[PDB]
Amino acid sequence: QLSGQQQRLLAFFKCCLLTDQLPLAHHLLVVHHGQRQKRKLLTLDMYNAVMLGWARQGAFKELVYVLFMVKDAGLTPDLLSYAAALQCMGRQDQDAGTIERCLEQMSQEGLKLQALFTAVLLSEEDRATVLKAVHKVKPTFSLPPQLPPPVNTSKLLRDVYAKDGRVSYPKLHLPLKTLQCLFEKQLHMELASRVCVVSVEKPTLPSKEVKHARKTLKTLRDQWEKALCRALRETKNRLEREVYEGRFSLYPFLCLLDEREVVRMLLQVLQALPAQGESFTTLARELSARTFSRHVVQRQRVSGQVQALQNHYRKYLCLLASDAEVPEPCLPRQYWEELGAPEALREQPWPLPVQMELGKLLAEMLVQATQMPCSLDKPHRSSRLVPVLYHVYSIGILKPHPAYVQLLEKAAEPTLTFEAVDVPMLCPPLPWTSPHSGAFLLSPTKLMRTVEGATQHQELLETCPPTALHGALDALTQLGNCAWRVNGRVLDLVLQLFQAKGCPQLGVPAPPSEAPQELRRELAHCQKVAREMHSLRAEALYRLSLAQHLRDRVFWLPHNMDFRGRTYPCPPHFNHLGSDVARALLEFAQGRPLGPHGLDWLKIHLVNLTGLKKREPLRKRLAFAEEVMDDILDSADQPLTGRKWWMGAEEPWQTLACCMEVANAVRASDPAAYVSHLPVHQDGSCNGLQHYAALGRDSVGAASVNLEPSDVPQDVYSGVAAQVEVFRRQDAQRGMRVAQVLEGFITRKVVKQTVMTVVYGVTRYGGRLQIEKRLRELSDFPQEFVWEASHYLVRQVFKSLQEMFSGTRAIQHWLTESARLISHMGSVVEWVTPLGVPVIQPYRLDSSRKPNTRKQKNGFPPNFIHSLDSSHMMLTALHCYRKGLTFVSVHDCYWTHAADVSVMNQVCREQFVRLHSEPILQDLSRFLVKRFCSEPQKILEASQLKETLQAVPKPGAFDLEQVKRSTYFFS
DNA sequence: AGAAAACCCA
């Protein structure tokens, strides 16, 4: 649309506003105004930018100059131009307070002053100055009184937003002053954009070469520090020259940040660089994005937004603190908005070519700025100052000359360095009051996770009724308000294995040592295994370094959504959706007493973690727990020196943590009045099958995946495993070798993924790879036939064909056909969840202007079922919040304290009915016939999709209220 | 690799 130079100079003038430097903008405006080619292609917005800037300084003569320049070249003043004019007229006492010409022309122009105060975004201080100007004269003007905020009136969301009800909202265990101090700590950790952590490695004792290298790097880094402060000042003068000669320049972009912070950034980029050099454009985009983030943090420090955030957060903590009482209790978004919400003043990203030019300029400073001696091993040897990194040609990756990387490797630097946003928050996160504001204090966290800069996700989120997202945001805040701590005993044991030779049986990666050590094939395989082990140990190193950092601290994990609705915590390395070790390290910081029923749920949780007794009732899982109590107590007491019963569990570290918790609870004097911090888990049987069976009301499926009450749990995977094992015997007696070598190897775990995936649009090749990976990890299985057996295991699993999951397949076929026809119409598949969240699919494999019908078709049934179980999770979260339950969730795995597992069940058995009492299939049908089938050009295609959508398959005969008495719906 | 057919563009 607009020219690239227009956006480029718009970014220039905006950054000149943000960095004082206003005579530079006036000079460039004058130079462009002189030349006829240059005075063309300016929009009104750049003169408007210089308008508000001279309004901030209040220079009346200069602003009258640029206002006179507005009328030339056919630009009439817009609303905000008049606003800045009112701001400068009121900044002085001119025109008897701005009415003598400005307000008369304001009324003559036909631009509404109400529309100025409402429609057009203004700064709050500028808005107050306009108020003072238009209050010196005309005192009969007053601001329109803003209404009380709207309260959502949907059927599922009536109960959570009904004012008259008995509520018990949970409060944190931390007082107001402690939470305020943690707010200060988080603010300091976010202003300093990186955090340094100690390695969990074994440290190296002082040696001659190690400390010689250690003092060599300090001298070289200080030398490059002075070199970088030379180069950036030289290019600052050189770019100010281009400003003063009438050229575009990046001079305010380098004055966005101080000299020091840029040099520190470039040094941290060298410290974080691997032995192999990274792509030049990737280094550029990383550097310029870091410049943007540090600018966003710096602008709030200068502009006074940080102090406003301080006062509001100190008032907001009264809701969460144990020692403070809000007069009427309410939700954190509601209490945030009831208090005066600060203006966001959203920093917007610059145009992408300007970002790339900044990254190129910084990286090309970094290339020709740093130098080092070549004679590293011999300091007395005379060597010229060899460039440390010239590989710009090369796909283009810079070269770390091997002296530097060997110097680092013999330096034994004990410190890793993280981003602020890659670390758990030290204070409770900001409430999700908007798709813009939430999670981190000073960083623009996104509502939906996305890649490659897909922006239609937000464009659906900001085009909604304002009360639609209220259910989702209050869910994410509830997921973010969970207080976590680190289980230190598990950390001690894992670091004991990590600092020694690792234990790959229990998940601790092996060192570069104990690696495997005609000939070429074996050497290549040894190098491959060495690289994989080194990579896994680097991952575990980073995770355990954050865990040891947060060992003594209470931290919060802010949550985002994806597009389809499911919720993930923002800090990546150490979260509760990670592996066995990561879940074993994490624990609830707030603890709730067990009560009369908590210890039974702890024991059932332990038996669920062992992986034994999956086919059993709860009474016999509990009887198993009493059977193996001595093994539990020995595993808790002697993990690595006892009989190691916990190691044989399917999730050994979580089993060990639960063994410790159960051992503390049993040996307690009153196990009912024991404060338990362990998250007890409840999981759906087959949630794709659960939601398909509840949509189709299929009695056979509902009985099959436990929507109908039964004494014993029912698994589809154990059914199909025996149903293919009978043919494994029947073909083995015909003398087939592939059936003969699979004896004792047809389990739930090898067919679990395939029968999980049959309800989605799976092909036989994907099922083949699915069983193939599981057969590769089978050590007892001979590895020769792993390919062949995989084919034999996607054959004979046609047992799902014989009228198995029938209404499931009808629902699947209609969703698949709907996605196919929507995409063949040319449109992307969108739908609104029953809680109101709009969902769009970012597939678009044109290059991105057509929808990829294969990807849309294969994506619609999983994305829709994930939307439903995310909505079910959010309803369960909200109605547990009304009953004072601490709830988190790994994507159908609902986690809470043991004392709440009954209540969490009941809400899970209520909001599954209340969600599925609504005609989700019919509401989806009418939404997609209104949104997608109302076009004039494609009446026949709309008729075909109309016949498809209006032929939603009929519900079966299953009363959903039975789910209320289903014991093993979630177990 | 390879056992593998269906969909999309010629």
Add this chain to the structure above:
DNA sequence: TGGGTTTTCTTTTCTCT
């Protein structure tokens, strides 16, 4: 009708080219 490409969906981490 003939030839090329994918293979159910999402999320996350690490070192080597």
Add this chain to the structure above:
RNA sequence: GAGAAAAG
């Protein structure tokens, strides 16, 4: 970009 690994 491949080498892997993890969660639903």
